[PDB]
Structures are given as C-alpha cells and as structure tokens.
Design a protein around this motif. Structure first.
Motif, PDB file in Angstrom:
ATOM      1  N   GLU A 245      -5.710 -13.886  17.981  1.00  0.00           N
ATOM      2  CA  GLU A 245      -6.378 -12.844  17.210  1.00  0.00           C
ATOM      3  C   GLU A 245      -5.784 -11.478  17.512  1.00  0.00           C
ATOM      4  N   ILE A 246      -5.542 -11.183  18.790  1.00  0.00           N
ATOM      5  CA  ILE A 246      -4.989  -9.883  19.158  1.00  0.00           C
ATOM      6  C   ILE A 246      -3.587  -9.720  18.585  1.00  0.00           C
ATOM      7  N   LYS A 247      -2.766 -10.768  18.681  1.00  0.00           N
ATOM      8  CA  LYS A 247      -1.408 -10.681  18.157  1.00  0.00           C
ATOM      9  C   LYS A 247      -1.411 -10.494  16.647  1.00  0.00           C
ATOM     10  N   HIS A 248      -2.255 -11.246  15.935  1.00  0.00           N
ATOM     11  CA  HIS A 248      -2.361 -11.068  14.491  1.00  0.00           C
ATOM     12  C   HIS A 248      -2.821  -9.659  14.152  1.00  0.00           C
ATOM     13  N   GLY A 249      -3.801  -9.143  14.896  1.00  0.00           N
ATOM     14  CA  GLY A 249      -4.277  -7.797  14.639  1.00  0.00           C
ATOM     15  C   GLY A 249      -3.197  -6.754  14.827  1.00  0.00           C
ATOM     16  N   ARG A 250      -2.379  -6.904  15.869  1.00  0.00           N
ATOM     17  CA  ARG A 250      -1.287  -5.959  16.092  1.00  0.00           C
ATOM     18  C   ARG A 250      -0.246  -6.056  14.981  1.00  0.00           C
ATOM     19  N   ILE A 251       0.147  -7.285  14.638  1.00  0.00           N
ATOM     20  CA  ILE A 251       1.107  -7.484  13.559  1.00  0.00           C
ATOM     21  C   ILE A 251       0.614  -6.804  12.297  1.00  0.00           C
ATOM     22  N   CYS A 252      -0.653  -7.028  11.953  1.00  0.00           N
ATOM     23  CA  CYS A 252      -1.177  -6.526  10.694  1.00  0.00           C
ATOM     24  C   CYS A 252      -1.472  -5.038  10.743  1.00  0.00           C
ATOM     25  N   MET A 253      -1.756  -4.478  11.916  1.00  0.00           N
ATOM     26  CA  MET A 253      -1.864  -3.029  12.017  1.00  0.00           C
ATOM     27  C   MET A 253      -0.528  -2.381  11.692  1.00  0.00           C
ATOM     28  N   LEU A 254       0.546  -2.875  12.313  1.00  0.00           N
ATOM     29  CA  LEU A 254       1.869  -2.362  11.975  1.00  0.00           C
ATOM     30  C   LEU A 254       2.195  -2.617  10.508  1.00  0.00           C
ATOM     31  N   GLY A 255       1.844  -3.797   9.998  1.00  0.00           N
ATOM     32  CA  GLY A 255       2.158  -4.115   8.616  1.00  0.00           C
ATOM     33  C   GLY A 255       1.421  -3.235   7.627  1.00  0.00           C
ATOM     34  N   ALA A 256       0.145  -2.957   7.886  1.00  0.00           N
ATOM     35  CA  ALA A 256      -0.616  -2.078   7.013  1.00  0.00           C
ATOM     36  C   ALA A 256      -0.078  -0.658   7.067  1.00  0.00           C
ATOM     37  N   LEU A 257       0.307  -0.188   8.257  1.00  0.00           N
ATOM     38  CA  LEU A 257       0.907   1.140   8.336  1.00  0.00           C
ATOM     39  C   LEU A 257       2.221   1.200   7.563  1.00  0.00           C
ATOM     40  N   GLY A 258       3.061   0.173   7.705  1.00  0.00           N
ATOM     41  CA  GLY A 258       4.363   0.154   7.065  1.00  0.00           C
ATOM     42  C   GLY A 258       4.350  -0.222   5.602  1.00  0.00           C
ATOM     43  N   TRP A 259       3.227  -0.740   5.108  1.00  0.00           N
ATOM     44  CA  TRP A 259       3.083  -0.969   3.677  1.00  0.00           C
ATOM     45  C   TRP A 259       2.923   0.342   2.925  1.00  0.00           C
ATOM     46  N   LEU A 260       2.397   1.367   3.590  1.00  0.00           N
ATOM     47  CA  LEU A 260       2.156   2.663   2.976  1.00  0.00           C
ATOM     48  C   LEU A 260       3.131   3.739   3.418  1.00  0.00           C
ATOM     49  N   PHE A 261       3.708   3.631   4.615  1.00  0.00           N
ATOM     50  CA  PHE A 261       4.592   4.695   5.087  1.00  0.00           C
ATOM     51  C   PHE A 261       5.798   4.910   4.186  1.00  0.00           C
ATOM     52  N   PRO A 262       6.544   3.883   3.769  1.00  0.00           N
ATOM     53  CA  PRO A 262       7.698   4.148   2.895  1.00  0.00           C
ATOM     54  C   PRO A 262       7.325   4.867   1.611  1.00  0.00           C
ATOM     55  N   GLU A 263       6.105   4.669   1.106  1.00  0.00           N
ATOM     56  CA  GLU A 263       5.672   5.398  -0.080  1.00  0.00           C
ATOM     57  C   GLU A 263       5.551   6.894   0.176  1.00  0.00           C
ATOM     58  N   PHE A 264       5.448   7.310   1.437  1.00  0.00           N
ATOM     59  CA  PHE A 264       5.368   8.721   1.797  1.00  0.00           C
ATOM     60  C   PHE A 264       6.697   9.280   2.282  1.00  0.00           C
ATOM     61  N   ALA A 265       7.453   8.502   3.050  1.00  0.00           N
ATOM     62  CA  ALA A 265       8.753   8.937   3.537  1.00  0.00           C
ATOM     63  C   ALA A 265       9.583   7.712   3.879  1.00  0.00           C
ATOM     64  N   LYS A 266      10.878   7.798   3.592  1.00  0.00           N
ATOM     65  CA  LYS A 266      11.817   6.720   3.852  1.00  0.00           C
ATOM     66  C   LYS A 266      12.932   7.224   4.755  1.00  0.00           C
ATOM     67  N   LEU A 267      13.444   6.332   5.594  1.00  0.00           N
ATOM     68  CA  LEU A 267      14.608   6.680   6.389  1.00  0.00           C
ATOM     69  C   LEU A 267      15.778   6.979   5.456  1.00  0.00           C
ATOM     70  N   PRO A 268      16.624   7.961   5.780  1.00  0.00           N
ATOM     71  CA  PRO A 268      17.712   8.306   4.852  1.00  0.00           C
ATOM     72  C   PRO A 268      18.613   7.134   4.523  1.00  0.00           C
ATOM     73  N   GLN A 269      18.779   6.187   5.447  1.00  0.00           N
ATOM     74  CA  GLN A 269      19.609   5.023   5.163  1.00  0.00           C
ATOM     75  C   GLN A 269      18.996   4.152   4.074  1.00  0.00           C
ATOM     76  N   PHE A 270      17.668   4.024   4.056  1.00  0.00           N
ATOM     77  CA  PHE A 270      16.968   3.136   3.139  1.00  0.00           C
ATOM     78  C   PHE A 270      16.252   3.900   2.030  1.00  0.00           C
ATOM     79  N   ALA A 271      16.810   5.035   1.607  1.00  0.00           N
ATOM     80  CA  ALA A 271      16.184   5.804   0.538  1.00  0.00           C
ATOM     81  C   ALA A 271      16.174   5.021  -0.769  1.00  0.00           C
ATOM     82  N   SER A 272      17.254   4.291  -1.052  1.00  0.00           N
ATOM     83  CA  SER A 272      17.346   3.561  -2.312  1.00  0.00           C
ATOM     84  C   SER A 272      16.346   2.413  -2.384  1.00  0.00           C
ATOM     85  N   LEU A 273      15.942   1.862  -1.243  1.00  0.00           N
ATOM     86  CA  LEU A 273      15.072   0.696  -1.251  1.00  0.00           C
ATOM     87  C   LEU A 273      13.729   1.031  -1.893  1.00  0.00           C
TER      88      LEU A 273
END
Ligand code: CLA
Ligand code: CLA
Ligand code: CLA
Ligand code: CLA
Ligand code: CLA
Ligand code: CLA
Ligand code: KC2
Ligand SMILES: CC1=C(C#C/C(C)=C/C=C/C(C)=C/C=C/C=C(C)/C=C/C=C(\C)C#CC2=C(C)C[C@@H](O)CC2(C)C)C(C)(C)C[C@H](O)C1
Ligand SMILES: CC1=C(C#C/C(C)=C/C=C/C(C)=C/C=C/C=C(C)/C=C/C=C(\C)C#CC2=C(C)C[C@@H](O)CC2(C)C)C(C)(C)C[C@H](O)C1
Ligand SMILES: CC1=C(C#C/C(C)=C/C=C/C(C)=C/C=C/C=C(C)/C=C/C=C(C)/C=C/C2=C(C)CCCC2(C)C)C(C)(C)C[C@H](O)C1
Ligand SMILES: CC1=CCCC(C)(C)[C@H]1/C=C/C(C)=C/C=C/C(C)=C/C=C/C=C(C)/C=C/C=C(C)/C=C/C1=C(C)CCCC1(C)C
Ligand SMILES: CC1=CCCC(C)(C)[C@H]1/C=C/C(C)=C/C=C/C(C)=C/C=C/C=C(C)/C=C/C=C(C)/C=C/C1=C(C)CCCC1(C)C
Lengths: 176, 92, 173, 188
Positions: free
Chosen positions: A43-71
């Motif tokens: 449960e703890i491992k799934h929660g950590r995975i999904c916390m990072l996943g939920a953060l990263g599902w929205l972060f690129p919509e706000f800012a992208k690394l210059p290397q992955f701007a096209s993505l």
C-alpha cells in the motif's frame, strides 16, 4: 469489536487500529488471508508511486523540461513519444531504487515502507512522525484514486487533465 | 540400489546451497575475485557491450570483428553482476 | 601494501615469491585462474616479444640476400603479409606449432606441479649453473621481456602511424 | 591548522539554528557541520569524501589550467586549434581530430591516460568502502615529501578548502566563457 469505517460490522481481527492509517476498513478481509506487513508495504509503495504519478500527470501541463518541450501535454502521448533510450534509463533508475526494497523485503525486517530515506530528518519528532505516517498513507490513497481517474480521463479525451477541465469535455462519447 | 556409481569429472565439489547465497565455488575460476572487481567488470562490460551492439544494430555486409566480439559483453555483464551479488553475500 | 601501487592492498595471489614480483595487480587478474598459468603465459610473451623487438631492429638494419626482391619496400606487418603468400610464414607456423605442441605437454606438466613455469631445461651454453647467477638471470629475463613487450608494441604502432621501421624512424623523425 | 575547535570539527556549525546530521563525522578534515540536505545519511561518507577530493583536485587543475591557457599557449597549438579558449579548445581539438589532422589528438590522449589511472585506482575506492586501510583521498603520492608530520593537518584542510573554492571558480569561469566568450583574465 466494531469497525470504525463500517460502524455496523465487526472490526477485522487483524486490524486492531494500532497500525498507521487503520480505521478498521476491510469489508473483504484481505488482512485475514495475506500477510499484513506485506500488505502495508505494498500500500505504501503504491501510494508513493501514485503520488509521483499524479504530480507528474499535471506538471508537464504547467512546465516542461527544455529537452522535452515538443512532447505532448497528454501524459500517455508523451510516454509513447519519449523513446526506448530514455525509458530504458528510467527503468534502470527505478530498478536500482527497487533493489533496496528487494533487500529490505526478502533479506531484512523493518517498519513497512522504511528504506532509510529521511535526508532532511523530518521524522525524528514522534508526534510529527505519526502525523506524517498517516498523512503519507492517506495522500497515497488519494493519489492512487486520482491517478486512476486521470489515466482513464486521458484515455477517453486524449488530452491532459487541466486541458480537459478547461475545455469542459467532462463527459464521454463512448469507448475509444 | 545396485546401480553402478556415477562417474563425475575431477575436482567435483558440492555446490548445493540453502544459504542466502551460493558458496562461491559456483564461480569456478573466478571464485577468488572480489565483489568490487565483479561490480566494475559488470559495469564496464555492460557499457562496452551496449556500445558495440549499437555500432552494429544496422548490420552491414562487413561488420567489424572487434565490435562483434565486444557485443558479447552485454550477456557477460549479467553473469558478472550476479557474481558480484554472490561474492558480496559470501563475505567478499 | 603493494610496493608497486602504494595505495592498494598487496595482491592476495602474489606473495612476492616469484621473480619480478612487486605486488602489481591493480585489477586483480591473478585472483582469477592459476598464477602458474599466468607466469607461463608471461614468460612466453616475454621471450616472444623480445625476440620480436630484436628482429624488428635487425630487419630494419640488415636483410638476407634476395629478400629485397620478394618484399619490395615492405616493413614489419607489410613483410608479414608479403611473405605469407611466399610461404615463409607458413613454414615458421608449422615448426612453431610443433614446438608449441610439445610446450602444451610442458604446460600440462606445469599445472600438475611437475614443471616450473617457463622452464624448458634449455641451457646449452651452461649459463646459470650457479644458483645466484640463475636468479639474477631470471630477474633480468623477466624485466627485459616486459620492456621488450612494451618496445615491440611501440615499434609496431609507430610503424602503423608513420609506416617506418623502428631505427629508420629514429634516424629521421 | 587542524584547529579541532576553530576551523573544523567539534562544535563548528555552519547553520546555528539547525544541527548537522548524526552520520556526518566531526573527525573528518573540513568538517564545518554543513550537510543540510543529509546526503551523508543517504550515501557513505567515505564515498562522498572520495568524490569531494576528486572533484576538488580536478577543479583546481581546471582553474589553474584556464588561467595558464589564457596567459600562455604552447608553441604550435595555435596552428592546430586556431584561437580557442576554455571549452572552445576542447571542441577545437575534437573537431580537428574528426577533420583528420594529426597533432589534434590531445583530448584523446588525455582521456586514455586519465581513464587508465581511474581504472587502476577504481579498486582503491572499493577497498576503502570495504573498511580498508586507505583513507578516502590518500593515494600515498607525496614524492617531494611536502606534506608530512605536522604540516599534514594544515595541508589536508588547505587541500579541501582550495578544492571547494576551485570547484566554485571553474564553474564561474566556464559560464563566463559561455556568456562573454572570454577567458579568466579576459573577463577581469
Ligand atoms: C510516476 C512517475 C513519473 C513518470 C512515469 C514520468 C514520466 C515522464 N515524465 Mg515525469 N514527472 C514526474 C513523475 C513521473 N514522470 C513528477 C513527479 C514530476 C514533477 C517534478 C514530473 C515532471 C515532469 C516534467 C516537467 C516532464 C516530465 C516528462 C516526462 C516524460 C519524459 C521523462 C522525463 O523527462 O521525466 C522527468 C521527470 C522528473 C524530472 C521527475 C521524476 C523523478 C522524481 C524526482 C521522482 C515521461 C513520460 C517530460 C515530458 O515528456 O513532458 C511532456 C517533461 O517535460 N515529467
Ligand atoms: C479523484 C477522483 C476523481 C475525480 C475528481 C474524477 C473526475 C472526473 N471523472 Mg472520474 N474516475 C475516477 C476518479 C475520479 N474522477 C476513478 C477512480 C475512475 C475509475 C478508474 C474514474 C473513471 C472515469 C471515467 C470512465 C470517466 C470519468 C470522467 C470523469 C469526469 C466526469 C465525472 C462525471 O461525469 O461525474 C458523474 C458522476 C457520476 C455518474 C456518479 C456515479 C453514479 C453513482 C450512482 C453515484 C453514487 C453516490 C454515492 C453516495 C457514493 C458513495 C456511496 C458509498 C459510500 C456507499 C471528471 C473530470 C468522465 C470523463 O472524463 O469523460 C471524458 C468519464 O467518462 N471518470
Ligand atoms: C618474434 C620473432 C621474429 C619473427 C616473427 C620474425 C619474422 C621474420 N623475420 Mg626475422 N628476425 C628475428 C626475429 C623474428 N623474425 C630476430 C631476432 C632477428 C635477428 C637475428 C631477425 C632477423 C631477420 C632478418 C635479417 C630478416 C628477417 C626476416 C624475417 C621474415 C622472414 C623469415 C626470415 O627470413 O627470418 C630470418 C631470421 C633468422 C634466420 C634469425 C632467427 C633467429 C631466431 C628467432 C632465434 C633463435 C635462437 C636460438 C634458439 C638460440 C619474417 C617476417 C627477413 C625479412 O623479410 O626481413 C624484412 C629478413 O631478411 N628476420
Ligand atoms: C582540468 C585540467 C586540464 C584540462 C582538461 C586541460 C586541457 C587542455 N590543456 Mg591544459 N593545463 C592545465 C590543466 C588542464 N588542461 C593546467 C593545470 C595547466 C597549467 C600547468 C595547463 C596549461 C596549459 C597550457 C599552457 C595549454 C594547455 C592546453 C591544453 C589542451 C591540450 C593539453 C595540454 O597541452 O595540456 C598542457 C598541460 C600541462 C603541461 C599540465 C597539466 C598536468 C598537471 C601538471 C598535472 C587541452 C584543451 C593547450 C591549449 O590548447 O590551450 C587552449 C595549451 O596551450 N594547458
Ligand atoms: C599542446 C599540444 C601541442 C601541439 C598541438 C603542438 C604542435 C606543434 N609544435 Mg609543439 N610543443 C608543445 C605542445 C604542442 N605542440 C609543448 C608542450 C612544447 C614544450 C615542450 C612544445 C614545444 C615546441 C617547440 C619548441 C616547437 C614546437 C613546434 C610545434 C609545431 C611544429 C607544431 C604545430 C615548432 C614550431 O612551431 O616552431 C616555430 C617548434 O619549434 N613545439
Ligand atoms: C593547492 C591545493 C592542494 C593542497 C593543499 C594539497 C595537499 C595535499 N595533496 Mg594534493 N593535489 C592537488 C592540490 C593540492 N593538494 C591537486 C590539484 C591534485 C591533482 C593533481 C592533487 C593530487 C593529489 C594526490 C593524488 C594526492 C595528493 C596528496 C596530498 C597530500 C600530500 C602532501 C602534499 O602534496 O602536500 C601538498 C603540497 C602542495 C599543495 C604544494 C604544491 C602546490 C603548488 C605550489 C601549486 C601548483 C600550481 C600550478 C600552476 C599547477 C596533501 C594533503 C596525497 C594525499 O595524501 O592525499 C590525501 C595524494 O595521494 N594530492
Ligand atoms: C644466408 C642465408 C640466406 C637466407 C636466410 C635467405 C633467406 C631468404 C628468404 C627468407 C625467407 C627469402 C624470401 C629469400 C629470397 C631470395 N633469396 Mg635468399 N637467403 C639466403 C641466402 C641467399 C643467397 C646466397 C641467394 C639468395 C637469393 C635469393 C633470391 C633470388 C632472387 C633472384 O635472383 O631473382 C630470392 C627471391 C639468390 C639471389 O638472387 O641473390 C642475389 C642468391 O644467390 N639467398 N632468401
Ligand atoms: C520522503 C521525504 C521527502 C519527500 C518528498 C516528496 C518529494 C514528496 C512528494 C509528495 C507528492 C508529490 C505528493 C502528491 C500527492 C498527490 C495527490 C494526493 C493527488 C491527488 C489528485 C487527485 C485527488 C485528483 C484529481 C483529479 C482528477 C483525478 C480528475 C481531474 O479532472 C480533477 C482532479 C485534478 C481534481 C524529502 C525529499 C523532502 C526528504 C524528506 O526527508 C522526506
Ligand atoms: C637463454 C639462452 C640463450 C639465449 C638467448 C637469446 C637468443 C636471447 C635473446 C634475447 C633478446 C633478443 C632480447 C631482446 C630484448 C629487447 C628489448 C628489451 C627491446 C626493447 C626495445 C625498446 C625498449 C624499444 C624501443 C623503441 C620504441 C618503442 C620506439 C621505436 O621507434 C624505437 C625504440 C628502440 C626507441 C643462449 C643463446 C645464450 C644460450 C643459453 O644456454 C640459453
Ligand atoms: C568542456 C565542456 C563543457 C564544459 C564544462 C564544464 C567544465 C562545466 C563546469 C560547470 C561547473 C563547474 C559549474 C559549477 C556550478 C556551481 C554552482 C552553481 C555553485 C553554486 C554554489 C552556491 C549556490 C553556494 C551557496 C552557499 C553555500 C552552499 C554555502 C555557503 C555560502 C554559499 C557559498 C553562498 C561544456 C559544458 C561547455 C560543453 C563542451 O562541449 C565541453
Ligand atoms: C499498460 C497500459 C495499457 C493501456 C493503458 C495505458 C497506455 C495507460 C497503460 C497503463 C495503464 C495503467 C497504469 C492503468 C492503471 C489504472 C488505475 C490506476 C486504475 C484505478 C482504478 C481505481 C478505482 C476503480 C477506484 C475505485 C474506488 C472506489 C469505488 C471507492 C469507493 C469508496 C467510497 C466512495 C467511500 C468509502 C469506501 C470506498 C470503497 C473507498
Ligand atoms: C584455421 C583452420 C585450419 C584448418 C583446420 C582448423 C580447424 C584448425 C581451422 C580452424 C578454424 C577456426 C579456429 C575457425 C574459427 C572461426 C570462428 C570462431 C568464426 C566465428 C564467426 C562469427 C561471426 C562472424 C559472428 C558474427 C556475429 C554477428 C554479425 C552478430 C550480429 C549482431 C550483433 C553483433 C549485435 C546486434 C545484433 C546482431 C545484428 C544480430
């Protein structure tokens, strides 16, 4: 005797409320069958995975690394676009991280989810430590639910979460 | 019970193990190699094998023999890293 | 320890008994395999490489009558390639292979402990009857053979870079 | 110096309000009590000190070399790499190597020899991590006999401090080159 989560049902025998994040919620009784320490670690491992996943599902919509701007701002489309080499490097990094978990699970005993990662020493105070344990568990649960929803919304709309909210195409048109 | 004794090669030892790791006799000629040596060997082999494989992925009609030879280090690195573990958990 | 590499531990296999043993094995290649096998290989390489270096110099200086016609201007590996077609390298290979079959028997004896590595009992002129002279000679052989391995590597790669034999290179540069 | 109580070690605390991590040793040379992000807790301090000394030595060499290259160039290198400064010289040598000019393999030779030293020294790091006699940074290379006896403690602290300073300085130099295109002396 009675479960906190379900007041009309008897408390699960293994869940006595002492462990963090325990409200006596086990309608199907997974704790009776499977090892409770293993369940807590999973449960703890799934929660950590999904916390990072939920953060990263929205972060690129706000800012992208210059290397992955096209993505694409769609996380699934970005995953398809990344390419084998970057994904292989991420996989190697994750496997190096998971080697420690492998060692702690199969060749060691410890508090569930305790891999020794506390660089900032925020867990030394027992009261703050208890609050942080329960908070980690609950944020992980919320992140699991949110990220499952996010993955399915991306499947349906073929867009990011923020883009879907802004365009207000909240409702489906059928299977993709 | 009347079966003839089974002949085995010379210097055949007992490699059966129920411990956390095998006995380091499993590694044969490399039984005395250090765990750090195995780790460095595995990393170097993986890098060199990956590079030599990439230098040959679009295989031409005249591939380089040295690149072909070095591409065999990627499979070799697996064994090396497994050995590193074995030798780390056998005390070295 | 390791007098050679002062910041590394002495190699476990190397106890300092063998001639030319300065505790030099940073990568721990003596741990893998048998040290007797590695010493046999090292002495084979030493003798072969010092013969090769002396031969490179002597070919640069003098050439046997009529070899100039066969090899033209070839030097070093060019001579090798030119004379493989002629057949000289083939005869050398045949005879060296004979000697090396018998050296295979010798190596099998060495691994059993009967033979000291690199010892073929070849002492026609009788040098080394005195034990101290033999020890000195053994150390000199090992050191010169190592120097010669490095020297022949340098000569061959200088030929690769410039196309000039060792001494012809040294003359002009 | 090695002022256990003055310039390094013991109550020395870089950040008065936050105490250092328990894992950080106060006996190590250069200990000001600075590890807010707790890298010592995650990683072995022996490995971290090896890395710090290697970085400090490389950066000290890089800064001294930047200054030296700006003030003087060896006879003939201008012919091969035109006029190039700092990382520009690195790129120029690599481009000439690609172009096929000999006299333009300096970076390849440097890589070969430095990598040889690192490969033969890699075992030393492993022995240090395995509880060996060797200290993290000590390669026993003191031919001139400069740092011995009493000096040792001043020499180690000076080495670490100058290494950190050079780590900062070489980054400053490289980024100043990337912006202005000038050298250490050129900028000032
Ligand atoms: C479940 C975890 C997870 C996964 C599988 C991915 C996967 C991906 N992310 Mg990442 N990402 C994550 C978490 C994750 N992310 C988190 C927590 C953040 C917030 C910091 C980000 C922020 C982020 C950005 C800003 C970008 C990506 C991008 C990407 C893609 C290329 C790899 C990359 O640059 O990663 C970078 C990931 C990180 C820097 C953080 C992950 C590691 C932390 C420290 C744990 C790839 C599909 C790129 C992309 O294609 O965007 C369209 C991109 O530009 N991610
Ligand atoms: C954090 C959680 C979260 C959030 C905020 C959202 C948000 C959204 N989802 Mg959902 N979703 C989630 C988790 C979440 N989801 C999860 C975990 C899954 C399963 C993997 C899904 C699967 C999913 C799909 C398949 C779809 C959405 C869609 C949507 C959007 C429209 C919702 C809608 O029409 O509601 C309408 C609400 C209902 C119909 C309510 C359900 C009906 C029952 C009768 C309600 C019962 C109420 C009862 C009191 C509950 C508690 C009872 C219990 C205590 C006994 C919206 C952005 C749609 C979308 O984006 O389309 C493009 C869409 O098609 N979601
Ligand atoms: C690693 C050892 C080695 C190898 C592989 C070769 C290979 C070759 N040599 Mg030789 N050469 C060697 C050592 C070696 N040499 C030494 C040590 C000398 C100095 C005596 C010479 C002097 C020499 C000359 C002058 C010439 C060659 C030439 C050649 C080529 C034809 C064979 C020939 O005529 O040899 C002839 C060599 C000999 C008769 C001397 C061999 C002495 C052996 C190695 C020592 C025996 C010691 C004994 C057991 C005590 C061939 C490429 C010919 C060529 O094409 O040159 C460009 C040629 O003209 N070599
Ligand atoms: C991080 C370390 C570093 C690196 C990567 C380089 C890299 C380079 N230097 Mg060197 N250089 C260094 C330190 C370094 N230097 C130091 C410490 C000095 C002062 C002693 C110099 C002084 C110097 C000069 C005067 C010149 C170079 C030049 C060069 C180029 C060819 C190599 C050479 O001739 O070195 C020479 C280095 C030494 C003789 C000493 C280094 C080893 C010490 C003693 C250990 C190359 C771009 C040439 C060039 O192309 O300039 C752009 C050139 O003209 N360097
Ligand atoms: C960093 C690498 C480098 C490169 C590419 C060259 C390249 C060259 N040098 Mg050399 N040179 C170097 C280092 C280098 N040098 C060093 C370290 C020294 C000091 C020992 C010299 C000392 C030196 C002298 C004394 C001379 C050259 C000369 C030359 C040119 C003939 C040739 C282009 C010659 C030249 O250009 O003369 C005008 C010449 O006479 N060089
Ligand atoms: C100026 C900074 C500095 C200082 C204070 C030290 C100090 C020390 N180093 Mg050294 N070291 C330095 C820079 C420095 N190093 C650099 C840049 C390198 C990379 C080549 C090394 C590489 C190195 C190794 C590989 C080893 C040492 C070791 C040592 C110790 C042995 C005694 C000794 O050499 O005394 C120090 C003497 C001096 C600093 C005088 C020389 C400085 C001149 C005046 C400046 C040259 C400038 C020029 C332009 C280039 C001592 C603590 C040995 C040790 O025991 O490590 C713990 C060891 O094994 N050092
Ligand atoms: C002292 C010992 C000796 C050695 C060790 C040796 C070795 C080799 C090798 C090595 C593998 C090759 C490949 C080779 C080749 C040729 N040798 Mg030669 N040779 C030796 C002696 C003589 C003598 C006395 C003569 C001679 C010759 C020729 C000719 C003729 C060419 C032509 O006439 O067209 C050719 C091609 C005759 C000659 O022409 O000499 C002017 C001649 O009289 N060689 N020779
Ligand atoms: C361990 C540790 C450390 C640490 C740390 C770190 C880095 C911790 C990071 C923690 C993070 C990143 C936690 C993220 C939680 C995210 C959640 C709960 C998301 C929920 C989303 C939901 C409910 C949703 C939704 C939605 C859905 C599904 C549909 C949408 O239409 C609407 C909406 C958007 C509302 C550090 C490094 C400091 C060291 C220290 O010694 C201790
Ligand atoms: C044992 C035994 C016997 C025997 C015997 C025999 C036949 C013994 C023969 C021994 C020999 C031939 C030894 C040769 C050593 C050569 C060396 C060390 C070369 C170094 C070259 C270098 C460093 C170089 C170089 C160079 C490089 C790299 C760059 C080049 O541009 C040039 C340059 C030169 C500068 C006898 C017959 C006495 C009987 C006895 O009963 C048993
Ligand atoms: C050769 C080459 C290249 C190259 C290159 C190189 C050599 C690049 C080198 C880059 C370096 C050395 C960068 C250093 C950055 C240091 C920073 C930001 C320090 C910050 C310190 C702070 C904020 C301190 C804060 C504070 C702290 C912590 C403690 C006390 C107080 C204070 C100190 C103020 C390229 C890339 C050009 C490419 C080219 O093709 C090949
Ligand atoms: C591998 C692959 C293949 C194709 C798709 C894709 C390219 C994305 C890729 C990856 C797919 C992935 C990672 C999919 C993951 C799916 C996930 C995380 C799904 C999540 C589903 C979650 C669900 C239902 C949660 C249901 C929760 C419920 C009822 C909660 C109800 C409750 C309430 C309301 C009150 C209290 C009691 C209780 C029971 C807690
Ligand atoms: C010499 C002689 C004379 C008479 C009798 C005697 C038996 C003694 C005989 C001896 C013969 C001997 C010792 C022969 C030895 C020959 C040998 C070992 C040949 C080996 C050939 C192997 C080759 C090409 C392998 C090439 C491999 C390739 C492309 C692999 C491709 C690939 C690579 C490398 C990486 C990416 C994936 C991909 C594209 C599949």
């Amino acid at each position: 005797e009675m479960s906190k989560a379900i007041p009309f049902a008897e408390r699960p025998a293994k869940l006595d409320g002492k462990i963090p994040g325990d409200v006596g919620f086990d309608p199907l009784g997974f704790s009776d069958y499977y090892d409770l320490k293993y369940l807590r670690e999973a449960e703890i491992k799934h929660g950590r995975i999904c916390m990072l996943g939920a953060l990263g599902w929205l972060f690129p919509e706000f800012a992208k690394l210059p290397q992955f701007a096209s993505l694409s701002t769609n996380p699934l489309k970005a995953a398809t676009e990344l390419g084998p080499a970057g994904w292989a490097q991420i996989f190697i990094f994750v496997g190096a991280l998971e080697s420690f978990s492998y060692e702690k699970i199969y060749y060691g005993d410890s508090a569930p989810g305790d891999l020794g990662f506390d660089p900032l020493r925020l867990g030394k105070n027992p009261v703050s430590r208890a609050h942080y344990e329960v908070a980690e568990i609950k944020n992980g649960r919320l992140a699991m639910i949110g990220l499952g929803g996010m993955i399915h919304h991306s499947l349906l709309t073929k867009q990011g979460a923020i883009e879907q909210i802004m365009s207000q195409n909240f409702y489906p048109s059928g299977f993709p | 019970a009347g079966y003839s004794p089974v002949p085995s090669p010379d210097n055949t030892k007992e490699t059966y193990w129920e411990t956390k790791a095998p006995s380091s006799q499993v590694l044969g000629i490399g039984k005395d190699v250090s765990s750090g040596n195995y780790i460095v060997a595995s990393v170097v082999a993986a890098v060199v094998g990956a590079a030599c494989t990439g230098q040959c992925i679009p295989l031409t009609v005249s591939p380089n023999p040295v690149f072909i030879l070095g591409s065999f280090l990627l499979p070799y690195s697996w064994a090396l890293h497994v050995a590193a573990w074995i030798q780390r958990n056998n005390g070295k | 320890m390791s007098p050679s590499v002062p910041f590394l531990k002495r190699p476990v296999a190397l106890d300092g008994s063998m001639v030319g043993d300065v505790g030099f094995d940073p990568l721990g290649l003596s741990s893998v395999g048998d040290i007797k096998f590695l010493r046999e290989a090292e002495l084979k390489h030493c003798r072969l490489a010092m013969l090769a270096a002396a031969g490179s110099m002597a070919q640069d200086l003098y050439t046997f009558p009529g070899v100039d016609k066969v090899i033209g201007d070839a030097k070093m590996t060019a001579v090798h390639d030119k004379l493989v077609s002629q057949g000289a390298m083939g005869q050398l290979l045949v005879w060296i292979g004979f000697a090396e079959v018998f050296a295979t028997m010798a190596l099998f004896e060495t691994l059993d402990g009967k033979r000291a590595p690199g010892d073929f009992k070849f002492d026609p002129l009788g040098f080394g009857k005195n034990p101290e002279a033999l020890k000195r000679y053994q150390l000199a052989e090992i050191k010169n053979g190592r120097l010669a391995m490095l020297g022949f590597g340098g000569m061959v790669h200088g030929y690769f870079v410039t196309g000039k034999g060792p001494l012809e290179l040294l003359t002009n540069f | 110096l090695w002022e256990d109580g003055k310039v390094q070690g013991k109550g020395l605390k870089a950040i008065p309000f936050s105490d250092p991590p328990e894992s950080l040793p106060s006996d190590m040379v250069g200990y000001v009590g600075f590890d807010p992000l707790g890298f010592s807790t995650l990683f072995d301090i022996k490995f971290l000190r090896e890395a710090e000394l290697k970085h400090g030595r490389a950066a000290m060499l890089a800064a001294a070399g930047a200054i030296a290259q700006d003030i003087f160039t060896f006879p003939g290198v201008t012919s091969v790499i035109g006029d190039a400064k700092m990382t520009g010289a690195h790129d120029a040598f690599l481009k000439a190597a690609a172009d096929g000019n000999p006299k333009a393999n300096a970076m390849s030779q440097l890589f070969v020899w430095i990598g040889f030293f690192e490969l033969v020294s890699m075992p030393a790091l492993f022995e240090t991590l395995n509880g060996g006699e060797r200290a993290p940074g000590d390669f026993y290379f003191d031919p001139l006999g400069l740092g011995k006896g009493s000096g040792r403690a001043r020499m180690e602290l000076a080495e670490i401090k100058n290494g950190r300073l050079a780590m900062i300085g070489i980054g400053g130099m490289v980024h100043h080159y990337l912006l202005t295109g000038k050298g250490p002396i050129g900028t000032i």
